[PDB]
Amino acid sequence: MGSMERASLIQKAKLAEQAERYEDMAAFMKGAVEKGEELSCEERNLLSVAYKNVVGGQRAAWRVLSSIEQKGPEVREYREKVETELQGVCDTVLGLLDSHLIKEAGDAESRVFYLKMKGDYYRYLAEVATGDDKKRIIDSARSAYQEAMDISKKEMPPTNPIRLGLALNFSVFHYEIANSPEEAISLAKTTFDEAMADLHTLSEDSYKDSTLIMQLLRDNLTLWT
Amino acid sequence: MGSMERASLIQKAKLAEQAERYEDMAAFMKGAVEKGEELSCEERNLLSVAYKNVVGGQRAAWRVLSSIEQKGPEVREYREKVETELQGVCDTVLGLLDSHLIKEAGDAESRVFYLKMKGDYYRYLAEVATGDDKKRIIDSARSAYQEAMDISKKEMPPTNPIRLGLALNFSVFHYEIANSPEEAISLAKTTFDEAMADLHTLSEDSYKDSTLIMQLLRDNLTLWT
Amino acid sequence: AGSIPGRRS
Amino acid sequence: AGSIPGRRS
Numbered sequence: 221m222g223s224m225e226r227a228s229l230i231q232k233a234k235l236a237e238q239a240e241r242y243e244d245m246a247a248f249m250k251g252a253v254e255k256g257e258e259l260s261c262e263e264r265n266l267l268s269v270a271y272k273n274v275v276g277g278q279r280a281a282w283r284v285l286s287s288i289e290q291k292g293p294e295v296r297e298y299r300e301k302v303e304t305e306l307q308g309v310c311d312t313v314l315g316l317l318d319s320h321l322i323k324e325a326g327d328a329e330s331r332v333f334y335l336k337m338k339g340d341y342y343r344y345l346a347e348v349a350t351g352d353d354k355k356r357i358i359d360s361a362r363s364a365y366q367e368a369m370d371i372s373k374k375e376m377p378p379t380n381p382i383r384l385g386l387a388l389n390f391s392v393f394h395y396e397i398a399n400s401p402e403e404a405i406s407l408a409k410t411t412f413d414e415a416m417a418d419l420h421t422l423s424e425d426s427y428k429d430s431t432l433i434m435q436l437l438r439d440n441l442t443l444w445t
Numbered sequence: 446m447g448s449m450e451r452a453s454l455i456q457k458a459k460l461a462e463q464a465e466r467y468e469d470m471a472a473f474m475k476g477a478v479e480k481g482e483e484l485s486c487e488e489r490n491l492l493s494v495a496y497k498n499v500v501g502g503q504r505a506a507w508r509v510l511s512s513i514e515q516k517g518p519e520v521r522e523y524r525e526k527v528e529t530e531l532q533g534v535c536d537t538v539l540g541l542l543d544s545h546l547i548k549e550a551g552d553a554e555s556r557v558f559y560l561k562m563k564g565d566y567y568r569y570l571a572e573v574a575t576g577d578d579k580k581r582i583i584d585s586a587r588s589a590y591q592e593a594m595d596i597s598k599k600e601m602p603p604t605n606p607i608r609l610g611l612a613l614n615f616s617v618f619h620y621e622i623a624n625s626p627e628e629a630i631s632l633a634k635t636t637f638d639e640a641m642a643d644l645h646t647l648s649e650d651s652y653k654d655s656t657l658i659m660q661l662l663r664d665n666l667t668l669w670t
Numbered sequence: 671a672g673s674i675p676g677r678r679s
Numbered sequence: 680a681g682s683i684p685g686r687r688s
């Protein structure tokens with residue numbers, strides 16, 4: 221995408237989302253990141269939406285194939301093919317974050333957003349990991365989420381949607397990856413309760429955003445308890 | 446896919462469908478066709494399912510982008526990119542049919558199936574065509590559907606699901622491509638009525654198949670009248 | 671108008 | 680359990 225203008229890549233990412241062409245969307249946003257400039261709030265969301273949808277489809281396919289495999293070499297070979305593709309996309313996202321989105325992100329909102337992404341893509345790698353580096357992958361996810369949590373608690377109100385989504389995802393990490401269901405439940409409960417107590421400060425539109433994510437926390441708590 | 450066994454390609458196409466990985470499915474089935482052997486009934490369905498789903502998603506995206514365009518150069522450029530990809534997939538399918546599925550298909554069921562596909566992929570090309578060859582593309586679709594119709598009327602009962610689906614699709618061609626809504630309505634009505642009169646000959650499972658497609662014909666008639 | 675689906679569903 | 684969606688929808 222080196223020959224396309226940054227603004228054109230952003231415009232085409234928005235069109236790709238409208239057309240539900242998420243692989244294209246991700247390629248346009250990778251090109252935009254590689255222009256070397258920082259991303260605005262809206263642009264960060266385009267980047268996340270694109271890759272979350274691409275990897276989300278790969279994860280769903282990997283889960284279908286892994287179930288069939290658990291129940292000739294073809295099933296294993298094809299699960300491995302999908303797994304390698306998934307790992308490649310995660311590595312690409314992590315590479316964008318490391319070169320050089322995180323290091324240039326100084327504001328709490330941007331830095332937390334990117335560290336949350338870093339935790340998420342290591343978590344997706346951990347979902348399929350089985351080898352000698354699996355513990356290190358889990359710890360890489362944990363470390364990214366923890367740094368994001370530390371910044372968010374110092375710099376953002378408890379209703380901030382990025383802070384809430386980070387806590388939501390880190391709680392999923394604890395439950396599904398780290399074998400720490402009590403930590404997952406504790407984090408979700410404390411996050412929900414501290415957000416509830418801060419809703420009185422919010423406008424109608426901010427209230428809607430914060431309560432939407434609070435409901436996602438509650439949905440998980442209902443499933444886990 | 447030249448190094449993968451035919452049977453493994455077929456097995457992986459089935460897995461890809463279960464995982465909703467239709468691009469993979471199409472690539473596996475292209476590899477299977479390129480082994481040079483004829484396809485069984487089940488294998489013909491795998492080929493059609495794979496490419497119908499791939500091109501169906503491209504068509505939906507092209508329609509979103511074409512609507513935005515009708516309402517800088519970026520929208521046109523991106524619509525053109527999706528259009529070229531769509532044309533490439535249609536050309537690939539038509540190439541498989543021409544080399545050499547149709548020429549080796551002697552039984553009415555296989556030959557009608559492939560000629561129906563040929564009509565469909567020329568119809569998809571016609572949906573996006575605007576240049577000097579647009580009339581020829583439309584006529585190529587018409588000619589393929591017509592040959593399939595002629596064989597089906599001589600060799601298949603009026604309830605045969607391939608005969609019914611062919612008539613359904615040719616009726617859509619008349620309405621949406623050829624600007625012949627009366628021909629579309631006449632074909633759908635006569636097809637429906639002749640199938641109705643033959644249902645008494647069918648088993649429960651065949652009855653279910655034929656009535657399902659009859660309902661699709663009726664749905665179109667209700668929309669068109 | 672609808673054309674034939676890939677599968678009965 | 681659910682993680683954050685890409686968009687509010």
Ligand SMILES: *Cc1ccc(S(=O)(=O)N2CCOc3ccccc32)cc1
Nearest residue numbers: 381382385429432433684685686687
């Ligand atoms: C990680 C994260 C968290 C929130 C947001 S957002 O922009 O505020 N937004 C989009 C994602 O899903 C949402 C659900 C409910 C409220 C707001 C959002 C972005 C990234």
Ligand SMILES: *Cc1ccc(S(=O)(=O)N2CCOc3ccccc32)cc1
Nearest residue numbers: 606607610654657658675676677678
């Ligand atoms: C073109 C065509 C027509 C029918 C069939 S099928 O195998 O009989 N089948 C699969 C496709 O959708 C259907 C709907 C209702 C009944 C049967 C089918 C395959 C290709």
Ligand SMILES: [Cl-]
Nearest residue numbers: 297298301457
């Ligand atoms: Cl494979």
Ligand SMILES: [Cl-]
Nearest residue numbers: 258324325326
């Ligand atoms: Cl900065």
Ligand SMILES: [Cl-]
Nearest residue numbers: 232522523526
């Ligand atoms: Cl483009």
Ligand SMILES: [Cl-]
Nearest residue numbers: 483549550551
């Ligand atoms: Cl033959």
Ligand SMILES: [Mg+2]
Nearest residue numbers: 224225226227
């Ligand atoms: Mg420039």
Ligand SMILES: [Mg+2]
Nearest residue numbers: 449450451452
């Ligand atoms: Mg062989």
